[PDB]
Tab-separated table of C-alpha atoms and ligand atoms in Angstrom:
chain	number	residue	atom	x	y	z
Y	278	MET	CA	199.853	47.498	-0.385
Y	279	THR	CA	197.087	48.415	2.063
Y	280	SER	CA	194.339	50.883	1.167
Y	281	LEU	CA	195.958	53.341	3.574
Y	282	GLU	CA	199.321	52.992	1.828
Y	283	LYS	CA	197.596	53.485	-1.525
Y	284	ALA	CA	195.718	56.510	-0.200
Y	285	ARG	CA	198.990	58.161	0.767
Y	286	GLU	CA	200.428	57.483	-2.683
Y	287	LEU	CA	197.364	58.981	-4.350
Y	288	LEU	CA	197.527	62.063	-2.125
Y	289	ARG	CA	201.173	62.619	-2.996
Y	290	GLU	CA	200.113	63.037	-6.641
Y	291	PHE	CA	196.800	64.842	-6.088
Y	292	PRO	CA	196.600	66.279	-2.573
Y	293	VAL	CA	193.626	67.618	-0.656
Y	294	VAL	CA	192.376	71.133	-1.275
Y	295	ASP	CA	190.562	71.709	1.995
Y	296	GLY	CA	187.719	74.183	1.863
Y	297	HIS	CA	187.621	75.532	5.420
Y	298	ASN	CA	190.082	75.522	8.330
Y	299	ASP	CA	189.590	77.950	11.263
Y	300	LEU	CA	193.190	78.057	12.489
Y	301	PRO	CA	193.198	81.868	12.338
Y	302	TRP	CA	190.179	82.159	14.657
Y	303	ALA	CA	191.731	79.559	16.950
Y	304	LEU	CA	194.925	81.636	17.110
Y	305	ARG	CA	192.882	84.785	17.757
Y	306	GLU	CA	190.997	83.181	20.637
Y	307	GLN	CA	193.754	81.082	22.231
Y	308	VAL	CA	196.684	83.484	22.075
Y	309	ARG	CA	195.452	86.705	20.396
Y	310	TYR	CA	197.733	85.982	17.450
Y	311	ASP	CA	200.907	85.510	19.514
Y	312	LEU	CA	202.149	83.123	16.850
Y	313	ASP	CA	205.271	82.098	18.772
Y	314	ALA	CA	202.985	80.632	21.438
Y	315	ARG	CA	201.363	78.315	18.850
Y	316	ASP	CA	204.210	77.936	16.341
Y	317	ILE	CA	202.866	75.611	13.637
Y	318	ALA	CA	206.429	74.626	12.730
Y	319	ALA	CA	206.247	72.690	16.015
Y	320	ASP	CA	203.815	70.074	17.328
Y	321	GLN	CA	200.583	71.790	18.365
Y	322	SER	CA	198.526	68.637	18.937
Y	323	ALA	CA	197.791	69.662	22.543
Y	324	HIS	CA	195.991	72.834	21.451
Y	325	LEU	CA	195.064	72.688	17.791
Y	326	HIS	CA	193.888	70.386	15.018
Y	327	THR	CA	196.415	72.031	12.710
Y	328	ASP	CA	200.154	72.363	12.330
Y	329	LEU	CA	202.563	72.032	9.412
Y	330	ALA	CA	203.757	68.496	10.099
Y	331	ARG	CA	200.215	67.176	10.445
Y	332	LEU	CA	199.102	68.987	7.287
Y	333	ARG	CA	201.896	67.199	5.445
Y	334	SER	CA	201.066	63.821	6.993
Y	335	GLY	CA	197.436	64.418	6.066
Y	336	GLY	CA	198.228	65.072	2.419
Y	337	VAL	CA	196.905	68.628	2.398
Y	338	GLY	CA	198.200	70.478	-0.658
Y	339	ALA	CA	196.042	73.589	-0.500
Y	340	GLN	CA	194.074	75.222	2.285
Y	341	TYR	CA	191.383	77.852	2.267
Y	342	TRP	CA	192.151	79.508	5.574
Y	343	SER	CA	188.965	80.876	7.096
Y	344	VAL	CA	188.966	84.558	8.089
Y	345	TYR	CA	185.753	84.092	10.079
Y	346	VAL	CA	184.765	86.726	12.634
Y	347	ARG	CA	181.714	86.886	14.917
Y	348	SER	CA	178.569	88.443	13.477
Y	349	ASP	CA	177.211	89.157	16.972
Y	350	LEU	CA	179.950	91.637	17.898
Y	351	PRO	CA	180.747	95.108	16.537
Y	352	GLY	CA	183.765	95.803	14.322
Y	353	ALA	CA	183.488	92.810	11.993
Y	354	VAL	CA	185.427	94.569	9.247
Y	355	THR	CA	188.353	95.398	11.530
Y	356	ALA	CA	188.343	91.848	12.896
Y	357	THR	CA	188.298	90.407	9.362
Y	358	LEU	CA	191.354	92.497	8.495
Y	359	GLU	CA	193.050	91.078	11.604
Y	360	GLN	CA	192.185	87.534	10.495
Y	361	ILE	CA	193.585	88.238	7.006
Y	362	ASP	CA	196.728	89.664	8.624
Y	363	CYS	CA	197.063	86.463	10.648
Y	364	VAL	CA	197.020	84.364	7.457
Y	365	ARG	CA	199.569	86.718	5.848
Y	366	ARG	CA	201.859	86.415	8.877
Y	367	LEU	CA	201.617	82.605	8.838
Y	368	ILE	CA	202.570	82.505	5.162
Y	369	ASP	CA	205.492	84.894	5.775
Y	370	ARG	CA	206.723	82.864	8.779
Y	371	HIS	CA	206.762	79.533	6.960
Y	372	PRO	CA	207.932	80.065	3.346
Y	373	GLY	CA	209.406	76.575	3.234
Y	374	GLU	CA	205.975	75.040	3.736
Y	375	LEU	CA	203.331	77.588	2.645
Y	376	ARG	CA	202.821	79.610	-0.531
Y	377	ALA	CA	200.210	82.350	-0.928
Y	378	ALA	CA	197.713	81.470	-3.648
Y	379	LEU	CA	195.313	83.886	-5.329
Y	380	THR	CA	194.567	81.878	-8.464
Y	381	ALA	CA	194.122	78.368	-9.800
Y	382	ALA	CA	197.500	78.736	-11.485
Y	383	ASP	CA	199.045	79.626	-8.110
Y	384	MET	CA	197.581	76.406	-6.689
Y	385	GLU	CA	199.272	74.363	-9.414
Y	386	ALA	CA	202.516	76.297	-8.932
Y	387	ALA	CA	202.425	75.468	-5.231
Y	388	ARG	CA	201.769	71.793	-5.980
Y	389	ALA	CA	204.690	71.660	-8.434
Y	390	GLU	CA	207.118	72.945	-5.818
Y	391	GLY	CA	205.688	71.019	-2.872
Y	392	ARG	CA	204.276	73.903	-0.847
Y	393	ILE	CA	200.781	74.174	0.582
Y	394	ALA	CA	198.805	76.700	-1.442
Y	395	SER	CA	197.326	79.110	1.102
Y	396	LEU	CA	194.077	80.840	0.172
Y	397	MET	CA	191.521	82.792	2.216
Y	398	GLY	CA	187.768	82.547	2.584
Y	399	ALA	CA	185.603	84.971	4.555
Y	400	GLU	CA	182.855	83.335	6.580
Y	401	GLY	CA	179.737	85.489	6.565
Y	402	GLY	CA	178.464	88.523	4.671
Y	403	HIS	CA	178.725	90.624	7.832
Y	404	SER	CA	182.419	90.845	6.944
Y	405	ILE	CA	181.536	93.449	4.273
Y	406	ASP	CA	179.319	95.705	6.413
Y	407	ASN	CA	176.721	96.084	3.624
Y	408	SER	CA	179.415	97.708	1.455
Y	409	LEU	CA	180.258	96.548	-2.074
Y	410	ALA	CA	183.495	98.550	-1.981
Y	411	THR	CA	184.418	96.628	1.169
Y	412	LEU	CA	183.751	93.370	-0.683
Y	413	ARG	CA	186.145	94.611	-3.375
Y	414	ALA	CA	188.738	95.483	-0.707
Y	415	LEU	CA	188.554	91.965	0.737
Y	416	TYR	CA	189.100	90.555	-2.744
Y	417	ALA	CA	192.087	92.892	-3.204
Y	418	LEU	CA	193.572	91.579	0.054
Y	419	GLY	CA	193.292	88.008	-1.197
Y	420	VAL	CA	189.882	86.716	-0.120
Y	421	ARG	CA	188.671	84.162	-2.695
Y	422	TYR	CA	185.336	83.053	-1.265
Y	423	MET	CA	182.724	84.441	1.089
Y	424	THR	CA	180.118	82.400	2.928
Y	425	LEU	CA	177.042	84.554	2.481
Y	426	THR	CA	175.932	84.199	6.124
Y	427	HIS	CA	177.255	82.642	9.251
Y	428	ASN	CA	174.819	81.307	11.923
Y	429	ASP	CA	172.556	84.378	11.904
Y	430	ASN	CA	170.712	86.234	9.171
Y	431	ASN	CA	172.297	89.387	7.874
Y	432	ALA	CA	170.342	92.238	6.254
Y	433	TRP	CA	170.435	90.710	2.794
Y	434	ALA	CA	170.666	86.914	3.252
Y	435	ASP	CA	168.998	84.204	5.363
Y	436	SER	CA	170.977	81.724	7.462
Y	437	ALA	CA	169.997	78.070	7.855
Y	438	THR	CA	170.295	78.386	11.634
Y	439	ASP	CA	168.033	81.425	11.992
Y	440	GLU	CA	164.348	82.191	11.363
Y	441	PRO	CA	163.253	83.230	7.883
Y	442	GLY	CA	164.179	86.852	7.219
Y	443	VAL	CA	164.262	88.227	3.688
Y	444	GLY	CA	163.232	84.887	2.154
Y	445	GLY	CA	166.627	83.900	0.740
Y	446	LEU	CA	168.560	86.758	-0.868
Y	447	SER	CA	167.180	90.286	-0.897
Y	448	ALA	CA	167.671	92.524	-3.931
Y	449	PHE	CA	170.909	93.774	-2.393
Y	450	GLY	CA	171.851	90.156	-1.687
Y	451	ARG	CA	171.554	89.398	-5.391
Y	452	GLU	CA	173.717	92.453	-6.061
Y	453	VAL	CA	176.388	91.036	-3.724
Y	454	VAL	CA	176.341	87.778	-5.692
Y	455	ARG	CA	176.652	89.718	-8.974
Y	456	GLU	CA	179.633	91.640	-7.601
Y	457	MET	CA	181.284	88.477	-6.314
Y	458	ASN	CA	180.840	87.037	-9.810
Y	459	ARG	CA	182.440	90.123	-11.367
Y	460	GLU	CA	185.374	90.094	-8.933
Y	461	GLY	CA	185.972	86.365	-9.183
Y	462	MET	CA	185.136	85.655	-5.536
Y	463	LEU	CA	183.471	82.272	-5.044
Y	464	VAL	CA	179.978	82.339	-3.573
Y	465	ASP	CA	179.974	80.006	-0.568
Y	466	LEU	CA	176.605	78.546	0.433
Y	467	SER	CA	177.647	76.778	3.585
Y	468	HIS	CA	175.581	78.118	6.527
Y	469	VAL	CA	172.849	79.689	4.382
Y	470	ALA	CA	169.179	78.701	4.278
Y	471	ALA	CA	167.952	76.451	1.474
Y	472	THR	CA	166.001	79.443	0.140
Y	473	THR	CA	169.265	81.402	0.011
Y	474	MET	CA	170.934	78.491	-1.786
Y	475	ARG	CA	168.285	78.496	-4.491
Y	476	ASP	CA	168.348	82.286	-4.899
Y	477	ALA	CA	172.148	82.235	-5.166
Y	478	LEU	CA	172.052	79.478	-7.783
Y	479	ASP	CA	169.435	81.430	-9.758
Y	480	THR	CA	171.569	84.567	-9.673
Y	481	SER	CA	175.153	83.372	-9.942
Y	482	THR	CA	176.826	83.237	-13.352
Y	483	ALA	CA	179.784	81.379	-11.814
Y	484	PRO	CA	180.171	78.001	-10.126
Y	485	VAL	CA	179.334	78.220	-6.417
Y	486	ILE	CA	180.757	76.240	-3.513
Y	487	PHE	CA	179.820	74.868	-0.126
Y	488	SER	CA	183.115	75.188	1.753
Y	489	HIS	CA	181.987	72.958	4.630
Y	490	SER	CA	178.586	71.245	4.319
Y	491	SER	CA	177.397	67.659	4.115
Y	492	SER	CA	174.197	65.909	2.944
Y	493	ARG	CA	170.753	66.706	4.372
Y	494	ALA	CA	169.311	63.485	2.908
Y	495	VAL	CA	171.888	61.470	4.845
Y	496	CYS	CA	171.671	63.547	8.019
Y	497	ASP	CA	168.796	65.995	8.358
Y	498	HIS	CA	170.267	69.214	9.751
Y	499	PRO	CA	169.865	72.717	8.295
Y	500	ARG	CA	173.653	73.061	7.945
Y	501	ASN	CA	173.574	70.309	5.304
Y	502	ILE	CA	172.598	70.492	1.630
Y	503	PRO	CA	169.222	69.270	0.265
Y	504	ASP	CA	169.216	66.877	-2.677
Y	505	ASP	CA	167.402	69.370	-4.924
Y	506	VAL	CA	170.272	71.802	-4.422
Y	507	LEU	CA	172.921	69.115	-4.990
Y	508	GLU	CA	171.179	68.263	-8.262
Y	509	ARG	CA	171.711	71.822	-9.481
Y	510	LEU	CA	175.513	71.652	-9.090
Y	511	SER	CA	176.257	69.944	-12.408
Y	512	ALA	CA	174.499	72.738	-14.292
Y	513	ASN	CA	176.071	75.432	-12.133
Y	514	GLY	CA	179.497	73.791	-12.297
Y	515	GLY	CA	180.163	74.189	-8.580
Y	516	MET	CA	181.067	71.794	-5.784
Y	517	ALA	CA	180.037	70.686	-2.308
Y	518	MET	CA	182.921	70.239	0.121
Y	519	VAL	CA	181.903	67.615	2.661
Y	520	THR	CA	182.496	68.489	6.319
Y	521	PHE	CA	183.421	66.331	9.307
Y	522	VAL	CA	181.464	68.059	12.105
Y	523	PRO	CA	179.934	65.115	14.017
Y	524	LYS	CA	176.656	66.834	14.906
Y	525	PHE	CA	176.138	67.444	11.165
Y	526	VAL	CA	177.170	64.048	9.752
Y	527	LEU	CA	176.070	61.420	12.302
Y	528	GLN	CA	172.348	60.944	12.889
Y	529	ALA	CA	172.914	59.975	16.513
Y	530	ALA	CA	174.921	63.171	17.065
Y	531	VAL	CA	172.237	65.398	15.554
Y	532	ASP	CA	169.660	63.731	17.805
Y	533	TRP	CA	171.930	63.958	20.855
Y	534	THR	CA	172.617	67.649	20.327
Y	535	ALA	CA	168.881	68.306	19.936
Y	536	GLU	CA	168.216	66.504	23.215
Y	537	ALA	CA	171.092	68.367	24.917
Y	538	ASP	CA	169.667	71.693	23.721
Y	539	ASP	CA	166.172	70.728	24.908
Y	540	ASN	CA	167.613	69.790	28.283
Y	541	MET	CA	169.307	73.190	28.562
Y	542	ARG	CA	166.031	74.969	27.860
Y	543	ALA	CA	164.286	72.709	30.396
Y	544	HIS	CA	166.551	74.290	33.013
Y	545	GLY	CA	165.766	77.800	31.783
Y	546	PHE	CA	169.000	78.326	29.817
Y	547	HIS	CA	169.437	79.342	26.199
Y	548	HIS	CA	171.044	76.378	24.448
Y	549	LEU	CA	174.167	78.462	23.764
Y	550	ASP	CA	174.584	79.709	27.353
Y	551	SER	CA	178.151	79.067	28.517
Y	552	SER	CA	177.962	80.205	32.145
Y	553	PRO	CA	179.270	77.860	34.869
Y	554	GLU	CA	175.655	77.157	35.859
Y	555	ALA	CA	174.633	76.197	32.318
Y	556	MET	CA	177.792	74.113	31.988
Y	557	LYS	CA	176.845	72.147	35.101
Y	558	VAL	CA	173.493	71.308	33.502
Y	559	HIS	CA	175.113	70.182	30.272
Y	560	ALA	CA	177.696	68.113	32.132
Y	561	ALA	CA	174.900	66.293	33.963
Y	562	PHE	CA	173.223	65.500	30.653
Y	563	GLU	CA	176.392	64.124	29.100
Y	564	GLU	CA	176.945	62.115	32.268
Y	565	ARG	CA	173.685	60.206	31.777
Y	566	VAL	CA	173.789	60.272	27.958
Y	567	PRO	CA	177.303	59.950	26.511
Y	568	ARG	CA	178.162	61.900	23.366
Y	569	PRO	CA	177.960	59.670	20.263
Y	570	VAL	CA	181.085	59.417	18.141
Y	571	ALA	CA	181.190	59.616	14.347
Y	572	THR	CA	183.700	57.704	12.218
Y	573	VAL	CA	185.366	57.847	8.827
Y	574	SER	CA	182.542	55.591	7.638
Y	575	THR	CA	180.033	58.275	8.642
Y	576	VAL	CA	181.763	60.814	6.425
Y	577	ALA	CA	182.081	58.334	3.544
Y	578	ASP	CA	178.312	57.743	3.710
Y	579	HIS	CA	177.815	61.417	2.918
Y	580	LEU	CA	180.284	61.373	0.040
Y	581	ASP	CA	178.669	58.270	-1.456
Y	582	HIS	CA	175.277	59.946	-1.520
Y	583	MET	CA	176.623	63.307	-2.635
Y	584	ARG	CA	178.436	61.539	-5.478
Y	585	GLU	CA	175.182	59.880	-6.572
Y	586	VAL	CA	173.164	63.099	-6.575
Y	587	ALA	CA	175.685	65.833	-7.420
Y	588	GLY	CA	178.222	63.828	-9.413
Y	589	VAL	CA	181.898	63.112	-8.809
Y	590	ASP	CA	182.925	66.354	-10.557
Y	591	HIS	CA	181.055	68.381	-7.935
Y	592	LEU	CA	182.591	67.206	-4.650
Y	593	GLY	CA	185.404	68.325	-2.390
Y	594	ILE	CA	186.460	68.240	1.264
Y	595	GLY	CA	186.105	70.968	3.890
Y	596	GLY	CA	187.054	69.511	7.245
Y	597	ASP	CA	186.284	72.475	9.517
Y	598	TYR	CA	189.448	71.747	11.502
Y	599	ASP	CA	189.991	74.142	14.396
Y	600	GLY	CA	186.404	75.309	13.901
Y	601	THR	CA	184.735	72.545	15.878
Y	602	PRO	CA	185.811	70.982	19.165
Y	603	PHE	CA	184.608	67.515	18.146
Y	604	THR	CA	185.783	65.229	15.362
Y	605	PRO	CA	185.057	61.753	13.965
Y	606	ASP	CA	187.291	58.883	15.033
Y	607	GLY	CA	189.968	58.531	12.376
Y	608	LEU	CA	189.633	62.229	11.504
Y	609	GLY	CA	190.764	63.689	14.821
Y	610	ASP	CA	193.036	66.303	13.237
Y	611	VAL	CA	194.409	67.461	9.885
Y	612	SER	CA	196.572	64.333	9.582
Y	613	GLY	CA	193.463	62.198	9.121
Y	614	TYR	CA	192.549	62.596	5.440
Y	615	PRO	CA	194.322	59.424	4.258
Y	616	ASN	CA	191.925	57.396	6.443
Y	617	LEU	CA	188.994	58.839	4.510
Y	618	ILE	CA	190.642	58.235	1.152
Y	619	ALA	CA	191.377	54.627	2.194
Y	620	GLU	CA	187.718	54.070	3.135
Y	621	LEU	CA	186.613	55.429	-0.248
Y	622	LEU	CA	189.079	53.103	-2.000
Y	623	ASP	CA	187.543	50.206	-0.072
Y	624	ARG	CA	184.129	51.355	-1.314
Y	625	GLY	CA	185.327	51.238	-4.921
Y	626	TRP	CA	186.093	54.886	-5.630
Y	627	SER	CA	188.523	55.119	-8.559
Y	628	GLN	CA	191.875	56.876	-8.559
Y	629	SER	CA	190.554	59.529	-10.931
Y	630	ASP	CA	187.388	59.941	-8.815
Y	631	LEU	CA	189.592	60.601	-5.811
Y	632	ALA	CA	191.891	63.049	-7.635
Y	633	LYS	CA	188.769	65.080	-8.513
Y	634	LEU	CA	187.558	64.954	-4.901
Y	635	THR	CA	190.866	66.070	-3.451
Y	636	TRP	CA	192.420	68.382	-6.052
Y	637	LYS	CA	190.992	68.729	-9.533
Y	638	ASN	CA	187.459	69.908	-8.798
Y	639	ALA	CA	188.603	72.762	-6.565
Y	640	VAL	CA	191.124	73.999	-9.129
Y	641	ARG	CA	188.524	73.827	-11.920
Y	642	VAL	CA	186.029	75.790	-9.872
Y	643	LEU	CA	188.440	78.605	-8.981
Y	644	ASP	CA	189.584	78.779	-12.605
Y	645	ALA	CA	185.920	79.042	-13.649
Y	646	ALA	CA	185.386	81.942	-11.248
Y	647	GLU	CA	188.373	83.694	-12.839
Y	648	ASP	CA	187.005	83.027	-16.314
Y	649	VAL	CA	183.556	84.422	-15.458
Y	650	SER	CA	185.228	87.446	-13.848
Y	651	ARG	CA	187.262	88.183	-17.000
Y	652	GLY	CA	184.047	88.414	-18.997
Y	653	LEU	CA	182.175	90.532	-16.483
Y	654	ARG	CA	185.068	92.936	-15.817
Y	655	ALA	CA	185.340	93.563	-19.557
Y	656	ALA	CA	181.568	94.030	-19.910
Y	657	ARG	CA	180.846	96.581	-17.190
Y	658	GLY	CA	182.288	98.545	-14.299
Y	659	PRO	CA	181.902	97.713	-10.590
Y	660	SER	CA	178.611	98.392	-8.831
Y	661	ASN	CA	178.106	101.466	-6.714
Y	662	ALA	CA	174.703	100.318	-5.425
Y	663	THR	CA	173.703	100.638	-1.765
Y	664	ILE	CA	171.468	98.459	0.377
Y	665	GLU	CA	169.060	101.375	0.888
Y	666	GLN	CA	168.759	101.816	-2.870
Y	667	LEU	CA	168.006	98.165	-3.530
Y	668	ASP	CA	166.218	97.012	-0.372
Y	669	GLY	CA	164.627	100.279	0.731
Y	670	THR	CA	165.106	102.266	3.927
C	962	LDE	C1	183.024	80.310	16.434
C	962	LDE	C2	183.773	79.622	15.304
C	962	LDE	C3	184.786	78.619	15.868
C	962	LDE	C4	182.765	78.971	14.361
C	962	LDE	C5	183.435	78.358	13.125
C	962	LDE	N1	183.926	79.414	12.195
C	962	LDE	P1	182.390	77.276	12.086
C	962	LDE	O1	181.152	78.046	11.562
C	962	LDE	O2	183.285	76.887	10.919
C	962	LDE	C6	181.957	75.778	12.999
C	962	LDE	C7	180.472	75.331	12.930
C	962	LDE	C8	180.315	73.969	13.642
C	962	LDE	C9	180.697	73.972	15.083
C	962	LDE	C10	179.817	74.900	15.905
C	962	LDE	O3	178.579	74.727	15.894
C	962	LDE	O4	180.366	75.818	16.554
C	962	LDE	C11	179.849	75.376	11.519
C	962	LDE	O5	180.585	75.443	10.511
C	962	LDE	O6	178.619	75.326	11.466
C	963	ZN	ZN1	181.126	77.337	9.538
C	964	ZN	ZN1	184.519	78.448	10.299
């Protein structure tokens, strides 16, 4: 059979656990959670990267649904609860296809019965409003990882896409990591500064993840992971879940985006300005310099290098579907994963290598978080510390 046919067979046995899909945010923004208007039991290819049929075609067997909310708007906690509610409603609406999963055992139970294990991951520490009790509430509602920052610093952690702030994790930041370890919530180091990565690895007693990051050595962008951090994963036990975002994985796309941003500033606009006037400027740039397009090969280049440095036991996949408007050719929506698996087969990846990449590593890592949590919950009570106590007024 072809490598694509083989890929599909492999995925039927050991499907993809995807680390980060922003369907809930997409539903919030497109239709304010009017789920009938974007029914994922129907074909949503006109509007979304994700629906149930494409998840099945893509060989997705578990999904961490992102409950991302903006850090630059008030009411992050309320919005996070709305995102969690959206995930809950999706699970309730589609019991034939989705099964809530809170544990590694739940993931295996879902796989045994042919339903997509549906987990939740919060994207940014602003979702807890500097409150450890709020962190515990999110865990109680089903959140199983939290990215420590999004694109901006918060009071206790530095983001890769912001200026240096506290220098990594503050004292309170370390306390958040300790509490995540005690609860069994995975520490997610996507988005954070390299300093923050190192501080989190120093502090964490549980395996950490990167829910959607690729390799900085392969493509130098702050959203990607440095080799020295990848090297620490085998000791930590965690895993890096490669992402598909073109401007992170393809050199030409990083360079293009930098030039686009420079061009915006040359016209007196902030690079993130979305006014009609700014859009006209950007359109003119893209007119004279077409947007480069990444491929499956681009993503495989990251996995090859990440495998070499981090090890096959420390890799996963986090596509960022519905979180980015642009995708590599061959990975245009959630149905694309078999194309990546086929490319890896062609590059000599073994069947057991690929079962680790898709399924086994993610289940091991969540089980490890549970194991560490059992020990810590037995050893001490929850923390009552405040950010003022630990970081000062
Ligand atoms: C606003 C909302 C859709 C942002 C997403 N939650 P994201 O953080 O998942 C996508 C981003 C790449 C795409 C971009 O730069 O926006 C990244 O991961 O760095
Ligand atoms: Zn992100
Ligand atoms: Zn996201």
